[PDB]
Design a protein around this ligand. Structure first.
Ligand SMILES: Cc1cc2nc3c(=O)[nH]c(=O)nc-3n(C[C@H](O)[C@H](O)[C@H](O)COP(=O)(O)OP(=O)(O)OC[C@H]3O[C@@H](n4cnc5c(N)ncnc54)[C@H](O)[C@@H]3O)c2cc1C
Ligand SMILES: Cc1cc2nc3c(=O)[nH]c(=O)nc-3n(C[C@H](O)[C@H](O)[C@H](O)COP(=O)(O)OP(=O)(O)OC[C@H]3O[C@@H](n4cnc5c(N)ncnc54)[C@H](O)[C@@H]3O)c2cc1C
Ligand SMILES: CCCn1nnnc1NC(=O)c1cccs1
Lengths: 588, 588
């Protein structure tokens, strides 16, 4: 147990010191390494329960049982007198840089997970390279370091959402006494895009500085794993070379899918193109029904656009379907049109994009409903949001032996290890895990600590909370109502629910019973909270704190004994009492 | 023991049915009572682990041991055969209405706690009266049913806070691309006040309708307890009479204090007057430094006022003082002036309030600083926020025997009982308790269930979360850093902290490092979270859910293993890592 841990730790750490907090000899070695600018991990044996047994086990490698003991890439280097000898003779720098491979770690992909992993590993002395390359979209769009969320996902999406929310704030301001007239105010798309892209630019630059300041090598090059330790890289000038690494982390993410119909690639766009588009989309069709589809349609309508969403079957497949339908109903009452049970057949071009006057083109969209009736309408912009996929055939030679599942994602054990022992995978390409930025960041950081600092903590992927940033936001943590009933049976499930009205909505004359929350609980397990759901403003701020209590096993009684904060929306969770089985109305 | 619970339950309940969920004689008695419109409590002995011992205990009163046992006001009424015979002879209604007193419960005070307690008691067949009267302020202000929070507290205060927040939304909107010019937009105070007051009006009306629909007798009359069971009432027409009640709940709340200086009562106002004031206060002095003082100064500055705050010693006494100083620093950078270490000596009138044309007057304020220097400046409005106090002298005859503390608050045991066994106190007049609206509501509801439905659960007053609605909001749950250090010692306390920047503030060009959060933890108890603190937007929404986790005993490890929701402010709590002891800067 302890002896297997110590061997794994010694073999994979780049530079590591076994120490005690009280030892002045350990203190002296720490000071030497700090002066020499030699980064390393440290294990403090006195603060571990099995510290005495670990100290015994070290002799299997060093033949000594005292602290300090310093190791480099699996090799015992010395105790205090020996380390000082090397430093005094100007030998220590060469010893700590001796390596079989070019790098201790190569990260393929410079996004949410990969940048987090590479920075954390470098902290413990791992010589690290991060590779990032952005394949242009069909119309030619590209962007800088930081991945999907930074450039074409979470960050610009929520900033445009905030511009859309301010439309309603301008309306509400009249009722609260301000002299403006929302009727005479309009939105300038390109001014908003300039501001969003300026912030994104500062993040691109900030990641480059952070890698520079952590001594991480950044290569703006496309990588391909051609054997367990060899990565072939192609740089900006199409120069091809090979670099080697001890450990490999795959973190290459996904890109939007297109339907296989005429005109889709030529004349439509995806979210990759939307967030830097130089002109307002105009009259827009969004094809699809994921959270990406509904978030983008939502803010486009708030910013004054004529928006239609064409839905093949249901909204937000995979989420609680009562909540999904409430989300869609709010959007439809606030200016989004839906073409339900409908798919596209072809896109025909009526007008080329006008670069001269900074204006969209014009497209004819033909499709059909499930009963066979036809769909035909003109739109200035068509946005495809029909899912995302990895393309690991490009990243990864078949002969390496890394196992992929039926959707092309990497099959990993619960420590992110692939079927090849030195290769790991994190983020969206890890099969079966929630595809979210804070999941990729936690996975990458925790993995770096296990590989290079002897940590044992794994990432917990269960009950990860989400928020959908539609015009009225939807936060969730845990099971949908229908999954809970499927797993445990209707008899063992009790659901508490209520409508509510934000206080800010009263003087503004907004709707009385649209916002909604519910707790899905298991009767036979002390009324354990299985899932939490809320539709209302600031839904992500509301939901986050409860994710801790659910992780700790909160029951309905834990919610009841907690006192609310007044006046808030979130406090309504502390006093819920109407059950669905009672048939009593949830309106207030 | 079981037998003392039963004897207390029987003696106290108005109408109560001892039952089992699987007995058809029980079910038949319930249907008769339902049909007769007879409300009652029900105890299902089969769902209680000590049910069989209760049945033997029942024979004390009834000399039977079987289920169906009906009691009315301490007296056994009958089993199934007796109850059904009374009903078919039209004798049952008279039996269940028989009472020694006018009411089972008299609530003195119709505010947050008192309305809650009275409605809940009525659900179990307690014949209930709620008394409410609003003594006018010195200038004559009065209002309707619902108490301090509804009419002159949390509700109008947060609505005027929202009007202030919207001024910054109007500024932000230009940066997000909207065509308005905030420079050319102004605020109309009277439009605001008219909308706030029309909402409060709908709440006064809703409380009257709610009492009628629960068969609660509402008396708009001043009450005075003159003996344990007699309440003297007076009467919009000054008619004095006496009504009697079995149980009494005191819920009369507090009112603002005035300093004992010339001109204060004549020429200053309080929060009681501010929320319906028909003229804009203009150049305003706020005297005091409580959360009421700072909240009101904050929104008045945001709505265009020239505002000064006069501070005797410190800001937000009783709150974490690091956090209090950050709250005030933001306020000072956004147009609130502070006269620190300063106290008033007299208010002189220079011009009378123009009630005709809705203009304030003019006042000369004279004061002095602690060094000795003089204060003298003109203001159009002077607002006193120097604390709140009860006036139980008016409510409670000294001869009844209800003990008060040195501040005039009621001394209660942990079940809200006073030194007189049938008299209880809830809300702000209960000595030692947090003075918050959801605390009053939970105390009131839970107490009514113990008196009239045999419940045993007590209100938990520990770790009750708060939010101060200053222009940048401050949420907290648990201990301040300085109380934790005083209670456990500096060596046993670890503090994790970080600045943050809301994503909404990036494109709007707001401050990088003013929002702030921290977790105060106890090392020797598994890094238990003792206190949580956040300064930023939507702080009450952020804080609420974490209050459940802290009640369940969250540790730092529970926060670390939980995954964040991105992009939010609240997610910063899930990745905190900089300790105060390390000395590393908390900036982003
Ligand atoms: C529109 C949209 C909105 C979203 N909103 C949210 C939200 O609100 N909250 C949330 O939590 N998540 C959100 N997400 C999801 C989030 O963006 C992803 O879960 C996250 O970015 C995944 O990170 P990753 O590290 O796995 O991959 P990525 O961030 O996609 O990083 C992979 C990087 O590697 C590069 N790369 C690919 N192949 C190679 C190669 N061969 N060599 C070198 N580099 C290569 C890619 O170009 C990219 O830069 C959103 C996603 C989208 C599309
Ligand atoms: C400016 C301000 C802002 C506040 N903001 C918040 C906030 O954001 N959040 C929060 O949780 N709390 C807030 N509070 C506190 C909250 O208002 C109180 O905790 C709550 O109102 C107390 O309820 P209560 O039932 O104890 O008394 P009250 O609500 O004051 O009700 C007592 C009632 O009894 C009446 N009465 C008095 N004497 C008699 C008599 N003899 N006969 C009949 N009736 C009588 C009173 O006039 C009143 O109607 C705020 C308070 C103030 C002043
Ligand atoms: C055998 C006695 C019948 N009886 N006598 N008085 N009332 C009732 N029944 C009822 O009130 C009802 C029970 C179920 C539906 S109505």
């Amino acid at each position: 147990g302890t002896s297997q841990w110590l061997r794994k730790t010694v073999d994979s750490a780049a530079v590591i010191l076994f120490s005690k907090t009280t030892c002045p000899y350990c203190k002296k070695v720490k000071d030497v390494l700090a002066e020499a600018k030699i980064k390393h991990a440290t294990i403090e044996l006195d603060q571990l329960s099995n510290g005495s047994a670990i100290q015994k086990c070290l002799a299997s490698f060093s033949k000594i049982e005292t602290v300090p003991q310093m190791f480099v890439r699996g090799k015992f280097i010395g105790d205090s007198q020996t380390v000082l000898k090397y430093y005094s003779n100007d030998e220590l720098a060469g010893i700590v840089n001796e390596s079989k491979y070019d790098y201790d770690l190569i990260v393929i992909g410079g996004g949410s997970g990969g940048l987090a992993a590479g920075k954390e590993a470098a902290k413990y002395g791992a010589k690290t390279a991060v590779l990032d390359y952005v394949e242009p979209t069909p119309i030619g769009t590209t962007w800088g370091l930081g991945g999907t969320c930074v450039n074409v996902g979470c960050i610009p999406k929520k900033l445009m959402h905030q511009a859309g929310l301010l439309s309603h704030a301008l309306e509400d301001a009249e009722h609260f006494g301000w002299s403006l007239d929302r009727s005479k105010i309009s939105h300038n798309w390109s001014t908003m895009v300039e501001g969003v892209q300026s912030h994104i630019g500062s993040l691109n630059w900030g990641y480059k500085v952070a890698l520079r300041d952590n001594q991480v090598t950044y290569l703006n090059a496309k990588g391909r794993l051609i054997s367990p330790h060899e990565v072939q890289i192609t740089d900006k000038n199409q120069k091809v070379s090979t670099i080697t690494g001890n450990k490999i982390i795959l973190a290459t993410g996904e890109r939007p899918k297109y339907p296989e119909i005429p005109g889709a690639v030529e004349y439509g766009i995806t979210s990759d193109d939307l967030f830097s588009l130089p002109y307002f989309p105009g009259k827009t069709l969004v094809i699809g029904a994921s959270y990406v589809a509904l978030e983008c349609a939502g803010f486009l309508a708030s910013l004054g656009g004529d928006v239609t969403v064409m839905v093949r079957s249901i909204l937000l497949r995979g989420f609680d379907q009562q909540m999904a339908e409430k989300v869609g109903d709010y959007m439809e009452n606030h200016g989004v049109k839906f073409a339900k049970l409908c798919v596209p057949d072809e896109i025909k071009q009526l007008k080329v994009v006008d670069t001269e006057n900074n204006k969209p083109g014009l497209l004819l969209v033909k499709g059909h409903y499930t009963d066979g009736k036809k769909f035909e309408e003109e739109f200035e912009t068509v946005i495809f949001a029909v899912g995302r996929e990895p393309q690991l055939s490009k990243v990864l030679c078949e002969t390496v032996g890394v196992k992929l599942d039926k959707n092309g994602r990497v099959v990993c054990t619960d420590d992110e290890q692939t079927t090849v022992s030195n290769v790991y995978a994190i983020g969206d390409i890890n099969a079966g895990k929630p595809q979210l930025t804070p999941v990729a960041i936690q996975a990458g950081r925790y993995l770096a600590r296990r590989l290079f600092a002897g940590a044992t903590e794994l990432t917990d992927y269960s009950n990860v909370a989400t928020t959908v940033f539609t015009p009225l936001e939807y936060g969730a943590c845990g099971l949908s109502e229908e999954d809970a009933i499927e797993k445990y049976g209707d008899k063992d499930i009790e659901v508490y629910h209520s409508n509510f009205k934000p206080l800010e909505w009263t003087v503004a004359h907004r709707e009385d019973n649209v916002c909604y929350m519910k707790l899905v609980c298991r009767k036979s397990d002390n009324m354990r909270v299985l899932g939490l759901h809320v539709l209302g403003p600031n839904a992500g701020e509301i939901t986050q704190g409860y994710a801790v209590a659910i992780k700790m096993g909160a029951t309905k009684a834990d919610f009841d004994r907690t006192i609310g904060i007044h006046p808030t929306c979130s406090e309504t969770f502390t006093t819920l009492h109407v059950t669905k089985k009672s048939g009593v109305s949830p309106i207030v």
